Amino acid sequence: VKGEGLGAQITGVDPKNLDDITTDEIRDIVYANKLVILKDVNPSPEEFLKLGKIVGQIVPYYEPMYHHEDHPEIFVSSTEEGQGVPKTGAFWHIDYMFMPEPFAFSMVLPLAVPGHDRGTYFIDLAKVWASLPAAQQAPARGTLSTHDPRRHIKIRPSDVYRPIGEVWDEISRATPPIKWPTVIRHPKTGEEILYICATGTTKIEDKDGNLVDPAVLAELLAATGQLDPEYNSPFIHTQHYEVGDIILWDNRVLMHRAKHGTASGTLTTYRLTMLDGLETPGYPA
Ligand SMILES: CCCCCCC[C@H](CC(=O)O)NCC(=O)O
Numbered sequence: 221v222k223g224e225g226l227g228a229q230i231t232g233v234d235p236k237n238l239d240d241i242t243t244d245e246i247r248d249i250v251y252a253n254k255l256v257i258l259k260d261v262n263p264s265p266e267e268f269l270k271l272g273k274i275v276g277q278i279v280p281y282y283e284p285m286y287h288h289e290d291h292p293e294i295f296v297s298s299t300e301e302g303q304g305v306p307k308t309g310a311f312w313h314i315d316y317m318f319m320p321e322p323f324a325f326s327m328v329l330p331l332a333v334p335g336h337d338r339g340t341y342f343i344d345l346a347k348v349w350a351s352l353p354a355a356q357q358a359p360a361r362g363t364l365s366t367h368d369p370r371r372h373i374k375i376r377p378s379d380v381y382r383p384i385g386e387v388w389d390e391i392s393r394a395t396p397p398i399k400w401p402t403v404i405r406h407p408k409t410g411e412e413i414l415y416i417c418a419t420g421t422t423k424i425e426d427k428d429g430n431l432v433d434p435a436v437l438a439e440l441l442a443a444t445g446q447l448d449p450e451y452n453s454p455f456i457h458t459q460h461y462e463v464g465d466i467i468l469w470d471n472r473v474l475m476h477r478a479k480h481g482t483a484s485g486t487l488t489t490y491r492l493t494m495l496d497g498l499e500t501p502g503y504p505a
């Protein structure tokens with residue numbers, strides 16, 4: 221492990237001797253540093269899958285148009301016609317944050333990268349929460365937030381010529397809004413996390429079930445730095461893609477968003493998403 225914290229680089233990951241990596245060792249590195257780069261791995265699809273199985277329980281994405289043609293577990297973001305889906309993740313989110321079991325870990329392998337300006341922005345939601353005074357934290361504790369993904373589900377090739385209301389209705393059954401505690405506690409690190417997302421968090425309600433003042437959700441979102449279109453907030457870390465360098469991170473603690481670029485060429489990334497078996501997203505706080 222070269223550095224410490226978000227950009228930490230890890231050098232010994234050999235795609236033909238993955239049996240040397242144990243689950244507890246890679247998990248502890250990820251929990252501690254939150255975002256790590258497995259440098260110069262360049263795995264095949266099957267070696268990637270082996271590494272994913274080391275990390276945790278691989279969950280395939282629910283929508284098969286994202287699947288790798290040969291490996292349903294691999295979520296494919298690619299500008300190649302008919303390969304996965306182009307330009308995914310162009311908005312702040314947590315992977316599967318709208319689903320019954322959000323992922324513990326996300327893992328992205330960049331396969332083709334044009335230029336050197338694309339990657340992912342990350343925000344540490346535990347550091348945001350720890351930054352807030354107790355009086356500001358108090359309206360958020362013991363509440364439930366609603367996360368509505370539906371407006372961000374993408375039109376699929378098989379949706380062409382469907383009435384949009386029927387596509388919407390199908391989305392509403394597949395990915396209905398869901399409620400999570402506004403503040404959660406990481407089941408492993410003990411860290412409290414402000415689990416809110418400008419893209420999908422619509423409201424906060426208290427233990428009675430009453431609406432909390434809309435000014436509370438708005439203030440907290442602003443505090444995360446998710447509402448600055450110029451990405452200058454101190455809480456934003458920028459991680460640039462590099463071919464073969466695998467990006468692996470804690471999907472409970474980090475909110476992220478695609479960073480786009482200007483260079484011509486194919487952008488192709490493969491993603492594996494894993495549960496760790498612990499309370500997800502976390503314990504209520
Ligand atoms: C709660 C915020 C809604 C996020 C919409 C989810 C669509 C994305 C895929 C894509 O960006 O096309 N989901 C990926 C995942 O959750 O792992």
Ligand SMILES: [Fe+2]
Pocket residue numbers: 309313314315476
């Ligand atoms: Fe994502």
